[PDB]
């Protein structure tokens, strides 16, 4: 328990949690220009098990 | 040191011969550059090369831990190789954190020794002229950072004093100019055991004319005058250490008057037969030799027509041969060692016991030992890196003290060997004869 509480920067070892603040805490100052755009055409494709079940449905319907 | 860029690692990407720092990369990234043979010098600030100097010396001891005697000799060889690559430029006043004349702030070890207002106004210029004597700006375009740190400590010894505690009573200070090895806390205790020995054995032995060999900073010479020895004379092969020691004897009051300092290799001249200087015979000859890690290990014999030993054993046999020509009858020699010759080199036999048992020129009159109480550097050559003694080596080291007299002077010291609680050899009991 004391080894867990030692790794923070408390001055009096009083079982508090004081986190370290680095110089860059935001993504825009880390070189990332803007928010990442997800590929909406790639994530809306049908998965492989769904294609296999569609093939099984087309086999069993006829 | 002026670099030759054609023999460096990468003369195309770095045509200046070194890799500048800029204070951005990690310490282990610089440590990987130094281990491959690339020179490292700071680009902007002295803090970048000061942080690279402390961390590389700490990372090297983690890779090569001092586990036995053979691991300290390898670590001292590795640290001497790596710390020579950590350079600083010759014109250190063009760097940023050398001095700030408006904020009175500066980086470096000069803030441990000097004042903020005193350094940033007047002492940055006096240190600029202090380096020019030993390392001129023409011959040197770069300085090793260990030499830059030693120049800042030697400039402190030039500006103010250097107290020898607890050897000197708090007001007698010495000024070693440069290249003269001062004493640390570990280097003091072989002289602290000797000062207590000289306080009690002066008068029962009637010691008046003391001779000190290899004085260095003169700490062994000034310790004898405190115990009451009237005539002391020191011999030092360094000429600049002789001029500084005799100037400190004038500065240290009127109780250091009969102190003399001459330049000699080990002993005085003893060349003129017509002037007869042989009438000045000393009754106590003191020797406090230095024990470096490179000098304690490579002790071996060399020479065909003049076969001589090297290292610490060769320095002892120089002291054990020519001491009879300068000693009076009923006179003793005092040897101050620190037991590192037996710790760092345990396979070789004892060099002091090799003189007594085999050569049979000296008789062991007395022997004392005392364990080491403090920590610090041991026998530090000035322009090299600092290496403090580890804990497992510090607990087994002992400050020794060897008192020997002549084989011809057995009959005078015969009643000393007859007392209870003494160790007479088998040769001095045959000469007593009740």
């Amino acid at each position: 328990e004391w080894l867990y509480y030692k790794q923070f920067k408390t001055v009096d070892y009083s079982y508090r949690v004081i986190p370290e603040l680095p110089e860059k805490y935001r993504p825009h100052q880390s070189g990332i220009d803007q928010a990442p755009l997800p590929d909406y055409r790639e994530i809306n494709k049908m998965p492989q098990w769904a294609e296999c079940e569609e093939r099984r449905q087309s086999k069993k319907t006829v | 040191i002026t670099l030759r860029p054609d023999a460096t690692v990468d003369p195309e990407r770095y045509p200046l011969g070194y890799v500048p720092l800029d204070g951005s990369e990690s310490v282990d990234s610089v440590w990987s550059l130094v281990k491959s043979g690339a020179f490292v010098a700071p680009l902007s600030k002295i803090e970048t090369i000061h942080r690279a100097h402390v961390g590389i010396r700490y990372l090297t001891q983690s890779e090569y831990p001092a586990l036995s005697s053979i691991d300290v000799v390898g670590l001292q060889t590795r640290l001497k190789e790596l710390c020579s690559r950590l350079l600083i430029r010759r014109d250190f006043w063009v760097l940023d954190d050398y001095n700030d004349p408006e904020l009175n702030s500066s980086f470096g070890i000069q803030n441990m020794y000097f004042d903020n207002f005193k350094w940033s106004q007047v002492l940055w210029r006096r240190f600029q002229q202090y380096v020019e004597e030993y390392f001129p700006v023409a011959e040197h375009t770069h300085l090793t950072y260990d030499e830059y740190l030693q120049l800042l400590r030697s400039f402190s010894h030039f500006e103010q004093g250097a107290k020898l505690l607890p050897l000197l009573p708090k007001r007698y200070r010495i000024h070693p100019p440069f290249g003269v090895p001062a004493l640390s806390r570990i280097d003091m205790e072989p002289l602290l055991l000797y000062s207590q020995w000289l306080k009690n054995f002066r008068g029962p032995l009637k010691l008046d004319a003391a001779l000190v060999i290899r004085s260095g900073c003169g700490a062994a010479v000034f310790a004898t005058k405190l115990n009451g020895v009237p005539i002391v004379r020191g011999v030092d092969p360094n000429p600049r250490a002789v001029m500084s020691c005799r100037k400190d004897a004038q500065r240290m009051g009127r109780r250091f008057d009969s102190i003399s300092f001459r330049v000699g290799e080990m002993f005085p001249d003893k060349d003129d037969g017509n002037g007869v200087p042989n009438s000045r015979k000393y009754d106590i000859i003191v020797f406090y030799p230095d024990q470096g890690c490179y000098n304690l290990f490579f002790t071996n014999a060399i020479g065909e027509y003049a076969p001589v030993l090297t290292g610490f054993a060769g320095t002892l046999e120089h002291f054990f041969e020519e001491a009879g020509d300068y000693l009076s009858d009923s006179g003793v020699i005092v040897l101050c060692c620190t037991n590192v010759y037996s710790i760092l080199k345990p396979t070789e036999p004892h060099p002091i016991e090799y003189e007594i048992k085999v050569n049979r020129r000296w008789v062991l009159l007395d022997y004392y030992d005392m364990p080491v109480r403090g920590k610090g550097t041991l026998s530090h050559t000035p322009t090299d890196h600092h290496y403090r003694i580890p804990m497992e080596m510090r607990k087994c080291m002992r400050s020794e003290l060897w008192v020997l007299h002549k084989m011809t002077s057995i009959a005078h010291f015969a009643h000393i060997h007859n007392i209870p609680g003494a160790q007479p050899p088998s040769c001095v009991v045959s000469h007593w004869r009740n």
């Binding site: 986190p19 935001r26 928010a35 | 990987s32 942080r51 053979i70 702030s105 803030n111 004042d115 087994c396």
Partner: protein
Amino acid sequence: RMPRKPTPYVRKFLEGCPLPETLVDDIAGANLKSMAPFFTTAPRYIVAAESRLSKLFFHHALYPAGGARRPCRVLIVRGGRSVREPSFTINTGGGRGEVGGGSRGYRDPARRAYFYARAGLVKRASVDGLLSPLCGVIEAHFAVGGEKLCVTLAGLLSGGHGGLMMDDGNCASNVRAAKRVARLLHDAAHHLSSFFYVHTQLPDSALFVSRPVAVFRLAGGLEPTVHFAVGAPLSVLQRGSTTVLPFGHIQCLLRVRTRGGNTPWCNTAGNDDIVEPWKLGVSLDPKVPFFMRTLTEKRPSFVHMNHLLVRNDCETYLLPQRELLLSFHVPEEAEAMCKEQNEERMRRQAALGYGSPSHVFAEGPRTFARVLHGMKANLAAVEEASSTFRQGASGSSRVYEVRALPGDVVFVPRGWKYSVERIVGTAIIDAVAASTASPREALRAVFRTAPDPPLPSNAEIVGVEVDAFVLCYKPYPVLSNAQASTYVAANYVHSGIDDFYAKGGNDVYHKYT
């Protein structure tokens, strides 16, 4: 106030430089404030201090603040090995409670120093003293016909491969584990005495059962653990009805000797019958007179098998038992990722045409592009200095040679190749004689810390030594583009690490929904 003695002179105000706390935080790996771009493949050395390295700092050591996607570095931690005792519940007393769980790390070190005061025999410690019976009960399991020992070695290979990369098509695992040992015995048939290295699971002799439900414990009573290891340990299925292995994440690095057809010793050698080329002028004495180099054992002569231990399914924690030299061969994916990340950051942040100077640190106004080019050039110089280029089969990659000591922790990522060699001692080469000839004739003092090698178709198994303990962990997640674009280290200075390693990577919309 404080009582101060009055002086008629001026007062000295010292601003003396202390040991920098940022320096010991960067050395101990507990900084958590360094934003460092230009991810490289050079290994990082971390000296483990007292209570300064945990999972919180080791997670930032794996994934730095610059937005990394994969822990593509070998991490050497000096003195980071931990030893755990088995824990048990107390039936007696005032109630029921479990005690015994404790770590022997950072306080009981390996290789205690032997300093004493009295060709030449010195006293040293070459093996780890805590895990020495645990290595002994593994080495005695292979002690002895020869075919039973060969199928014992083939049956104990970790995952059927044992780290070796060999092409096997249309073959099951139990036949592949025999074919690898058959290939090693066919390769090592020509030499009189050679060796090879394998990964090996813990045998049945090293694990004993305890009645209380079912508790398996190690034979030596000590467990080699890493308290700063992040993630979950690797779960190995027992085959013999598939259940979990009780200590499957703890493996061994076995050195096996082949037959075909604590006292080091030092000697000082002499010779019978331009020095400093980096210095411009000539000196009366050399500034560095002697060199110190690491002595390694002899590799036998070399188609030829790969002989590289690659763990493609787990993260490796090497705990060495002897002084080893590990030659890491870098995979193509790590250097390709570092190259594309550095070039992406260079074309994003430095859009200036840079003026094309002579070298990078030339005279001129130090703009942002010049600072970035200088940092990239220093990173390339670090990569060129600490590595070498070898040949393959056609192939060429960076090889980093790492001196690993007993008590260290060598984190190896997945996909990294490495060859293992044993360090035999320490030599001293004077710089005067080495300027005229090779350093083999310039040897002055040689300490041999390993006096090992004795001298008493296919090949026969002679003996088995445990050179290192391999702690296998589950593969750490590789971040995507959107995960690395939104990864901020300041969100992980307190918590979120067990969620980072349990779930796949981090959340893309972490803490800004």
